[PDB]
């Protein structure tokens, strides 16, 4: 099974990772109120409304009633209301769902972020190798399998000691292989450590961050942040 994005991000935050969990809403009225209250802190900010469904490919999916996209930018709380009203109580159709679509009864309302870089990072049990592995790449061709077949050099696989877990040396090297320098190296190290603790201590079969981002804070500091999150379990 999988848990929803906002819950996965909350779990990551509990273990010390930086992730935009936003706030969940079960009505367009609530979504509007969330956005309106956020304008008390960052007046004029834009918003993103993300359908919370147990399926991927939301950004490029489309709703049964016509609207395009499960991840949509909004300029105002009223636009947040309108967008959320087309998601909540309706059926989203993506690549992963097929024509059958998937029901949505809730969204995440978050602030729109300035994104400088997007990475893919996942942690799973690699049966072939017999150990957990951290997989990551800086390519933006979406499909992780697509990049793997068109550019094997683009994918970094880090085998993890089943017993001791990741070592600082492994994570520092991965951070530099992804092109990070300066404070972002240790920032990425700390975030991947948190992600591995989620994977390990929560008995997950996969922790997948697509994308793991370099973002700018409202005062332009560059930090690592999970922009999407999917955590799977065996039940």
Q: How many Å is the Cα radius of gyration of the chain? A: 18
Query: Total residues contacting a second copy (rule CB under 8 A)?
Result: 30
50 is in an annotated binding site: yes
- Residue number, 9 or 158, with CB nearest to a second copy: 9
| Given 15, 81, 120, 196, the catalytic residue | 120
Binding window for Mg ion (CB under 5 A); candidates: 16-24, 93-101, 186-194, 226-234:
226-234
Nearest CA-CA partner of 171 in 140, 196, 145:
196
3-state secondary structure of 150: helix
CA dist 133 and 166 (Å) reads: 10
> Is there a catalytic annotation at residue 81?
no
197 binds, among a second copy, Mg ion, ligand ADP, none (CB under 5 to 8 A by kind): none
Nearest CA-CA partner of 83 in 32, 23, 33:
32
Residue 18 in the binding site for Cl ion (CB under 5 A): yes
217 binds, among Mg ion, ligand ADP, a second copy, none (CB under 5 to 8 A by kind): a second copy
b/e burial code for range 161-186 (CB count within 10 A of at least 16 → b): eeeeebeeebbbebbeebebeeebbe
Of 7, 59, 186, 200, which one interacts with ligand ADP (CB under 6 A)? 59
- Bind-site residues for ATP: 50, 57-59, 118
The residues annotated as belonging to the active site are 120, 208
């Amino acid at each position: 099974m999988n848990i929803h994005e906002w819950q996965s991000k909350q779990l990551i935050q509990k273990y010390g990772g930086r992730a935009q969990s936003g706030e969940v809403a079960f009505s367009p009225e609530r979504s509007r109120d969330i956005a309106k209250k956020l304008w008390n802190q960052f007046p004029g900010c834009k918003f993103v409304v993300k359908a919370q469904v147990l399926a991927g490919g939301r950004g490029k999916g489309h709703w049964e009633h016509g609207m395009q996209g499960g991840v949509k930018l909004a300029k105002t709380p009223e636009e947040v209301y309108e967008i959320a009203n087309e998601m909540i109580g309706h059926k989203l159709i993506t690549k992963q769902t097929g024509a059958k679509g998937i029901n949505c009864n809730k969204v995440m309302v978050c602030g729109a972020l300035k994104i400088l870089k997007e990475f893919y990072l996942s942690i799973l049990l690699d049966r072939a190798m017999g150990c957990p592995v951290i997989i990551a790449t800086s390519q933006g061709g979406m499909g992780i399998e697509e990049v793997a077949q068109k550019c094997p050099e683009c994918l970094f696989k880090v085998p993890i000691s089943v017993k001791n877990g990741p070592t600082n040396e492994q994570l520092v090297k991965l951070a530099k292989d992804l092109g990070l320098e300066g404070d972002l190296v240790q920032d990425c190290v700390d975030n991947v450590k948190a992600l591995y603790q989620v994977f390990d201590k929560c008995d997950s079969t996969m922790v997948e961050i697509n994308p793991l981002g370099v973002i700018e804070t409202p005062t332009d500091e560059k930090v690592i942040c999970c922009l999407d999150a999917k955590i799977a379990f065996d039940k």
